[PDB]
């Protein structure tokens, strides 16, 4: 089927259905991946090379997006996002109350991945 699990980084058409790569940088290659190679010019970067047609699924991060990003210096970094949210992403493992705003919510997961895109 699909060649990914999900995807943080899908570069899709906007077209039905969507044609699809995945971006993602992976460290060793899926059972579920044809192909696996450099990319961006970069022989270190490697990725998942598959073209798909279809959607793309969901993402593999712990938030849609995140305006307080707090990351670590790696590249890949390991993150965590502060936003208060309504509703924490389903792919959030640890999802608790916010003490200042108690209709929000803070996702408190780390996770180690591309920096998440701001959401505003």
Request: glycine share 4%; proline share 14%; hydrophobic share 20%.
């Amino acid at each position: 089927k699909r060649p990914w699990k999900c995807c943080d980084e899908a570069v899709c058409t906007r077209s039905i259905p969507p044609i699809c790569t995945c971006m993602d940088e992976v460290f060793e290659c899926p059972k579920t991946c044809k192909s696996c190679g450099p990319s961006m010019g970069d022989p270190s970067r490697r990725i998942c090379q598959d073209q798909y047609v279809g959607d793309p699924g969901p993402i593999c991060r712990p938030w849609e997006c995140c305006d307080k990003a707090i990351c670590t210096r790696s590249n890949p970094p390991t993150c965590r996002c502060v936003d208060e949210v309504k509703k924490c992403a389903p792919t959030c493992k640890t999802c608790l109350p916010s003490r200042s705003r108690p209709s929000r919510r803070v996702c408190i997961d780390s996770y180690f991945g591309p920096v998440p895109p701001r959401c505003t």
